[PDB]
Symmetry: C3
Subunit: 258 residues, 3 copies
């Protein structure tokens, strides 16, 4: 089914590819950030979810995502029950009740390193305290706190830029009650006009305390990930160059609780 | 509905707490107060809220002594429902207190936090002297703050509140938790302190209160110059108000300014009671 | 009995003796050479013991070791193979999931500086008393690991890996006691907070005053006494050092760095204690 996914958006594609590997067959799925519903359409038509629910921060997409679903997978669009309203993460009673019933919570959420291209406009400071905000995933840690409390037996499947390393993405889950599994990964290319200052800032400042530290971000010179390079190095070609071609992993990780 | 007399209209922080406590619905519940202090809150929960049973503790072990006396003199017909745990108790960190918390339906508290009236410590002291008359002329004494500095929400001055939420979730996972906050950092943060720690927040009640004159707000000004990376920028504006009604808003700097020009200007902020319900 | 050349492990083993593991099933993170495994088996009388180590070979070396040190028992020692950081393999979680007590003496700012060197030597000694007669693969090339634990709140006092462990045990074995060895330079309240912050009630099982080797850098602890709180407003933080072997004469990190300046070689002691975390039952 290499026709279902579309290579237009590599982030979205690796998400859907992991969603498939996830094994959503006959499950109740909640999607945080349904956006336009395509992932819902995909999870209903290709992965065969028994029921899909979800929400979005934007009060209007929930309704629009019902159309696309009705149009893109008409025969299964009666298993889609969005939760309407401006729902940040899962913070309304209905969302919690729906999340409380799901087997799998899935999403691809804001995180430093996402393509700027997003929003594209046709939720930040309260998350700043989170320990894993230090590497840009505060919002993702915020969801895991809620999921472990609201549905402690549900899987959680999330999409990540992997510039910060796989050991740390895994630690985001281990720190919050889940054992992670990488379901799918892909090397993508980032636009040429994209700012990675935050990642070179990572490998330069010191540890929690004034303590010694070695750390390098995972970047790639080629679209195959053959040659590696640190945040400081990939910024070189983009200093002596202007359109150099930089790559980084994007991956989908499942967190499965005890 | 509780008449308009039981609420302390002399200290608005306590008044907000008490109006909150009555909306919380403590009738018939077993309550545990972190920091019983003088016990006037206990008197209120027994006499006005109809608590079936109120327990609690305090860091200074003399208090619970005098708390009984005040309860007895304010709620004589219900004083037999008040069983505090004796001894110096920090948060709930003693076996007796953990045993009491584990049996309570609701844990309530108006804990130390950055932004509280700067005269709160001094008031407490004085009361120690007095009241502790029956002491025959007589530690930490104040929740140290070193050990609660690791907590993430200590970044907004709520580390001790967070330490409690970490304790209540482990020891009384079904219990509601009702806490008093100054709301300078805004309700998004206050709610997130609960969501981050296992609780669904609900704001029970809130008031615009006047901050004493000459109160330091530099910590809150410092929060707005929200330092970049990692990462990175953030617009963060604290919530202050110029008029009691709270119609005119200001930020920590816009307020640190109002005072700059005219010392004595009037600066208001919100105090609110939030309940955490475990998604249980 | 114990070794006098290694206080941390003397106090750690003592602790184990006080924890009352008679009858229990235990899991040790960082089994190393197997000396605590034998110590629990033979002195503590544990029902059965399991454990793992980051170094993937130690597990093989350990079973042998035990067999020689705990020949009678030792049938009750089932290690888990593989390079196991903390408890992060399905087999490890399986074994942790069914233990009554997880125990560990784990890397941490303020551990002895020569601790990596003692382990190399201890591995070298043991894989000779069992063969050997090899080269220098008795050797953690790890480095690897430390960065993923940088986000943990208690890593600001150098206990990040220890916190990272508690998050795992709480989820994997919510009813299990967790017994851990710490240098108490940052103070007993901070150590207690580490458990209390992560769903455990702490208890100090045993504590010893130990000598700091001279030469040990302690600028990190003096740095605690100077930087401000997360506020960041002023803070009052004093580390717990001592001037004497009995912990009579208290002393903070800054003044302890005074001495060393002055004398360049003064004794300097601090506390090592075993704390059990027990979760609400
Ligand atoms: N705090 C929040 N809670 C719920 N949904 C959110 C949210 N913040 C953003 N969203 C929604 O999440 C959707 C995707 S935003 C994440 C895009 C991702 N970086 C990628 O490359 O694919 C958007 O529709 C947005 O409305
Ligand atoms: N991340 C990790 N996961 C599991 N075991 C680890 C580990 N890091 C180190 N270890 C193990 O811990 C042991 C030595 S660390 C011991 C130092 C201790 N502070 C003391 O002074 O006594 C070795 O067996 C080592 O391989
Ligand atoms: C055995 S790894 C030890 C390193 C330790 N975390 C330190 O920085 O002191």
């Amino acid at each position: 089914p290499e026709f279902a996914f579309d290579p237009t958006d590599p982030w979205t594609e690796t998400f859907q590819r992991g969603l498939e590997i996830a094994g959503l067959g006959g499950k109740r799925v909640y999607e945080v950030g349904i956006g336009t519903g395509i992932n819902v359409a995909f999870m209903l038509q290709i992965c065969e979810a028994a029921l899909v629910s979800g929400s979005d921060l934007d009060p209007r997409l929930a309704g629009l995502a019902e159309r696309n679903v009705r149009d893109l997978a008409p025969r299964r669009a009666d298993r889609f029950h969005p939760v309407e309203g401006a729902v940040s993460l899962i913070d309304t009673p209905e969302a919690r009740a729906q999340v409380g019933r799901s087997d799998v919570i899935v999403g691809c959420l804001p995180q430093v390193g996402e393509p700027d291209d997003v929003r594209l406009r046709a939720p930040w400071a309260e998350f700043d305290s989170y320990p894993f905000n230090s590497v840009g995933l505060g919002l993702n840690e915020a969801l895991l706190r809620r999921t472990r409390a609201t549905a402690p037996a549900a899987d959680v499947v999330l999409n990540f830029g992997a510039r910060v390393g796989s050991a740390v993405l895994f630690e985001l889950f281990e720190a919050n009650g889940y054992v992670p599994e990488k379901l799918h990964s892909q090397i993508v290319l980032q636009h040429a006009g994209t700012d990675i200052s935050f990642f070179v800032a990572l490998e330069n400042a010191l540890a929690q305390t004034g303590l010694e530290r070695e750390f390098t971000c995972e970047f790639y010179g080629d679209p195959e990930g053959a040659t590696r390079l640190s945040a400081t190095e990939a910024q070189a070609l983009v200093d002596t160059d202007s359109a150099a071609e930089i790559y980084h992993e994007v991956c989908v990780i499942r967190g499965r609780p005890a």
